[PDB]
Amino acid sequence: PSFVNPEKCDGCKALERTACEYICPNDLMTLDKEKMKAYNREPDMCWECYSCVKMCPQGAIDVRGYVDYSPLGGACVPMRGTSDIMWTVKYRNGKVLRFKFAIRTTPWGSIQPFEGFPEPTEEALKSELLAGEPEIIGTSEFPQVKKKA
């Protein structure tokens, strides 16, 4: 499960919102108003999805594998950018692996949902065609499927 490093967490107090609290799909990350530092409120409900880890601007969050089956010592640390993500995998025995994968080919926030699509019409609303079809499918005509005689 995820855990927060006290030395690196600043409670996002210099930001408009708390990143980890905002991103967690299972509502596990929250702030200890006392320390003004985050913590995983229910680790046994952590999916180890690493969303909080990737979005913490201070890189204060890491993941310690579930105790049920994880010997101590292993770690996967991501450094997510805008077009790619870097990963460092550290083995219990000290071995270190480094990888880098692409994550997006376009700028963030650049999607134009219906770019190139014609306006919807009442007539079109009655057909089987979805927005952009049939051309977004790659065919000039709507794909046909043979019904059993």
Binding site: P25, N26, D27, T30, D32, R41, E42, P43, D44, M45, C46, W47, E48, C49, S51, G65, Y66, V67, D68, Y69, S70, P71, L72, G74, A75, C76, I85, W87, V89, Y91, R92, K95, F99, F101, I103, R104, T105, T106, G109, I111, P113, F114, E119, P120, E122, L125, L130, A131, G132, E133, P134, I136, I137, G138, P143, V145, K146, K147, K148, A149
Partner: protein, 642 residues
């Protein structure tokens, strides 16, 4: 187990209600939900309709694709953009045979003819798809393509947000029950929920509601029960909310007995699809035996399913179940031999596929890479153990549990239209209520692309429904007030009885969410074909499960919660309990074993195509508290032969 740092308690009467009026309400901002928001925004303009998306977490990473995915499992390729083109008829046949003969082909062919357009949009939006030197999408197996999908959900979330608008997206709001038309017991009128960030009760009034909550996980005890109780293969975030609210409203369920048992890397539950299909990895028992071959004979009895290619998923599971029953584990995924054989002695080639192997996990289930790191397992040197996980209830993957939904006018046969008051694509038997993704049953193998696509289909149909029928349901304020009281009841119960004990979590008058969940998991694990009995059950066990679930349902009325987080956990439990009951009743009704490998009814061990080649559909009547079942014979809709 949950131990809150401090209390966050509220009484229903002191919580403010926020009323939101909209035309189309989409519950769940995951892949199917984002697809619905995206498509609805396009057509809504025709009537100046308002579209609202409500999500319990944050759309940017919510749902099954939170970690990203390493492939898009459904891409037909009708023009040759990938390494392998396919036809729609071949796809429909593939899905029906994998389902052991039972699938709503009108629904499957429908999303399949639309899915490629969705994939193409995904790439246009920035999703990096693996490509060959010639520029073709890299195939994993016959129907999937590899992707650099770490940001798969964020990209789809951006598209949905740009389409519907941020002011129409409500996050950190948990929907727990639907609202029905005060003047029509079979029409939806909205839904109710509560914030998990502040004291606020939500009342959504809508003309059409689309259930996109994902499936249900944690109904069954997992293979790890401590911290790793959270390591479920499927999305732990999906707790059968759609199933619960829809069935309570009277929407009919279908194939709810058809769970999905995934065979994955042991403990971490990393994916095997790429390893089997792309890396050509072999699975062997503890004695180096390739059971897909040594257990081939056992599949001959299934006709023609046992001779299908590829072998139906449940039958693949059946072969490994036989090995487990014989006690031949550990079962290994020989990644070391797969990489060596693929590289062919070329060290540079080895390094490349080695990086691809790790990306397969780091882009989708990091825990598996973390497991390897903690256990000093180098995939190029030693194999990894694999095992089937506990059951999951969902309709988007290899399981088809979900609501009985209407198909398109041009494909749905009259045989399948009988139970729908209104014939709109993906609408349930409850007027104005649609179901998509995991929530729509009888049309599996949708996965990411297919779920987003089904959401698009339902969304357009919802706009068409509103403009054509001009629905105008009225919510019942008396019911809303009763639901508001129930919503926060757990908090009020905690405050009322906590003084009976010096320990908050050891009380004779209430159970906390984690306590009720442990109980649910034990019941299902032991009586409903869970891991405890190697997925076997019978009439007696199922009947006992209903008796124990009855005790638990009664005790849900005595649930307690100490903060908003736990209040959500309380309702997530309620949702799972009813989902579990529906699953048990469906397994009890079907007197055959059609999906050995998923579950076995030891009292009816054979597959029965003479009397059970039908969809099992049920309806729960809340007013009478009665369940009714009926068989709908399968009919082949699309042209194909074995």
């Amino acid at each position: 187990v949950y131990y809150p740092k401090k209390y966050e308690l509220y009484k229903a009467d002191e919580v403010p209600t926020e009323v939101v009026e909209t035309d189309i309400l989409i519950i769940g901002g995951g892949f199917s939900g984002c697809g619905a928001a995206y498509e609805a925004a396009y057509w809504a303009k025709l009537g100046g309709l308002k579209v609202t998306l409500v999500e319990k977490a944050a759309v940017e990473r919510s749902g099954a694709v939170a970690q990203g995915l390493s492939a898009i499992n459904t891409y037909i390729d009708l023009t040759g953009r990938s390494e392998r083109q396919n036809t729609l008829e071949d796809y429909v046949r593939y899905v029906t045979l994998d389902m052991m003969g039972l699938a709503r082909e009108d629904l499957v062919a429908d999303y399949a003819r639309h899915v490629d357009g969705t994939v193409h949009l995904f790439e246009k939006w920035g999703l990096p798809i693996w490509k060959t030197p010639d520029g073709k999408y890299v195939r994993e197996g016959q129907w999937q393509i590899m992707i650099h999908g770490e940001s798969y959900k964020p990209i789809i979330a951006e598209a949905a947000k740009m389409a519907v608008g941020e002011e129409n997206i409500y996050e950190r709001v948990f929907i727990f029950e639907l609202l029905k038309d005060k003047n029509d017991p079979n029409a939806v009128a909205g839904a109710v929920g509560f914030s998990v960030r502040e004291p606020k009760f939500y009342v959504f009034k809508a003309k059409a509601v689309i259930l996109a909550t994902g499936g249900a996980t944690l109904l069954f005890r997992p293979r790890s029960t401590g911290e790793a109780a959270g390591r479920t293969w499927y999305a732990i975030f999906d707790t059968g909310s759609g199933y619960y609210m829809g069935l309570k409203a009277g929407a009919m369920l279908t194939q709810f007995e058809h769970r999905f048992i995934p065979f994955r890397f042991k403990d971490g539950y990393g994916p095997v699809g790429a390893w089997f299909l792309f890396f050509k990895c072999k699975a062997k028992n503890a004695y180096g035996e390739e059971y897909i071959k040594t257990r081939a004979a056992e599949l001959e009895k299934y006709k023609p399913y046992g001779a299908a290619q590829p072998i139906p998923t449940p039958l693949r599971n059946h072969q490994v179940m036989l090995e487990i029953m014989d006690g031949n584990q550990p079962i290994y995924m020989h990644t070391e031999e797969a990489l060596a054989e693929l590289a062919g002695g070329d060290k540079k080639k080895l390094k490349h596929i080695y990086e691809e192997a790790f990306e397969d996990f780091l882009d989708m289930t990091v825990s598996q890479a973390l497991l390897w790191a903690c256990q000093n397992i180098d995939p190029q040197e030693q194999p990894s153990e694999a095992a089937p996980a506990e059951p999951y209830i969902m309709g988007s993957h290899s399981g088809e549990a979900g609501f009985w939904v209407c198909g398109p006018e041009d494909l749905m046969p009259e045989e399948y239209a009988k139970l729908f008051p209104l014939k709109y694509n993906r609408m349930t038997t409850v007027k104005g209520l649609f179901a998509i993704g995991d929530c729509a049953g009888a049309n599996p193998h949708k996965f990411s692309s297919g779920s987003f696509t089904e959401g698009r289909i339902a969304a357009k149909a919802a706009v068409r429904f509103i403009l054509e029928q001009k629905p105008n349901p009225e919510i019942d304020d008396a019911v809303v007030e009763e639901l508001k009281k129930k919503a926060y009841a757990p908090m009020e119960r905690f405050m009322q009885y906590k003084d009976l004990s010096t320990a908050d979590d050891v009380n004779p008058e209430y159970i906390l969410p984690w306590q009720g969940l442990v109980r649910l998991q034990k019941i299902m694990d032991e009586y409903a074909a869970g891991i405890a009995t190697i997925y076997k059950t019978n009439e007696k066990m199922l009947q006992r499960a209903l008796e124990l679930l009855a005790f638990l349902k009664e005790d849900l009325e005595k649930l307690a919660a100490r903060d908003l987080h736990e209040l959500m956990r309380a309702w997530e439990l309620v949702h799972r309990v009813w989902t579990a009951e529906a699953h048990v009743r469906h397994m009890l009704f079907r007197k055959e074993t059609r999906w050995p490998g998923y579950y076995y009814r030891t009292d009816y061990p054979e597959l029965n195509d003479e009397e059970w080649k039908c969809f099992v559909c049920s309806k729960y009547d809340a007013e009478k508290d009665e369940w009714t079942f009926e068989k709908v014979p399968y009919v082949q809709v699309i042209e194909w032969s074995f």
